[PDB]
Design a protein around this nucleic acid. Structure first.
Ligand SMILES: [Zn+2]
Ligand SMILES: [Zn+2]
Ligand SMILES: [Zn+2]
Ligand SMILES: [Zn+2]
Lengths: 85, 85
DNA sequence: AGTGACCTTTAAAGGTCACT
DNA sequence: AGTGACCTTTAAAGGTCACT
């Protein structure tokens, strides 16, 4: 299951077995180089029910569990689907 | 282009860019743990035309170009299709 | 604008069988 | 029994768009 939020997970995404929602979130965050601010103490619990309630803490736990930014495509590799040789 | 025989090659197989024929040859050789003997000096040229005329020299150069035996599935992984998680 | 269930696209695995 | 053109299956990458 998903290491950052607990939802159901079929395979690994950007280094960690993740939910479909946390694949999309982590992917859009890095492409847009988004930057967030947590309205509370950076201790927001990130489970399936509270997942969207803080984008900072949800990205913070993304980096903590070990999702790697470099996997989302950048420079030459942007746009191509599937595995890269 | 296929590194062992020169035929056309679409992708990489067991570590080296190879044709379908040399993918199949290399895979069954290792599964059957086959062992060959070269009817001549072990210098037999392996191109597309003479490709099947000596299975030792074609296997000899197969390991030389650098395809690795471990990729074909053994023990736990025998029988399973596709990429491994 | 952001979300995420759903989809296509890849590299590369093995399985198949007319032909030899 | 051996070959190899062809097929299906894997994980995992991006793209979509009704819903919010
Ligand atoms: Zn998730
Ligand atoms: Zn927070
Ligand atoms: Zn070849
Ligand atoms: Zn020979």
């Amino acid at each position: 299951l998903c290491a950052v939020c607990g939802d159901n997970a079929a395979c690994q995404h950007y280094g960690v077995r993740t939910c479909e929602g946390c694949k999309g979130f982590f992917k859009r965050t890095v492409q847009k180089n988004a930057k967030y601010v947590c309205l509370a103490n950076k201790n927001c619990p990130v489970d399936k029910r509270r997942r969207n309630r803080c984008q900072y803490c949800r990205f913070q736990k993304c980096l903590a569990v070990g999702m790697v930014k470099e996997v989302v495509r950048t420079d030459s590799l942007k746009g191509r689907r599937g595995r890269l040789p």
